[PDB]
Write a protein that binds this DNA or RNA. Sequence first.
DNA 1: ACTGGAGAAAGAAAGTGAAAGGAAGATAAAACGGGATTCATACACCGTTAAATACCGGTTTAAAAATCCCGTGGCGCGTTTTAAAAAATCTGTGCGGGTGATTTTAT
Length: 49
Amino acid sequence: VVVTLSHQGYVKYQPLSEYEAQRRGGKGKSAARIKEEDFIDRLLVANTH
DNA sequence: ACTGGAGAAAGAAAGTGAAAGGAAGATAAAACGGGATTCATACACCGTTAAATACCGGTTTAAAAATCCCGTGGCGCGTTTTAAAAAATCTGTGCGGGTGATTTTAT
């Protein structure tokens, strides 16, 4: 899974099989919904156990 | 006149019914956040080419690395406190036969 954390503190993880590889130079798809004033600071990849 | 019992007055202490109010609860309206559709529209993938960049050979030189002396504060040791977690000890409760008790209405 992949773990994301926001500045004010919000945790969540998603299955890794949802995002598919592509070629460099793209824009990508949104991974989470941000609030009015917040931003993502960390990103982690790890196993459930 | 005097005595001792008895009833009535008077006074002081305790129990009482009623008391704002305030923290401590409780209950609704509201604002919120997370899923099912619906596409148009912007994004992903495939051929072409000018241009921008990586790479090699040889200097150099100024800057950073290496070395030596020393004087301290930042870790290390030993011994106390102090919360935190764990083990030990109490407290209720229901199963089924027995003893004894309570309340409200109409005519």
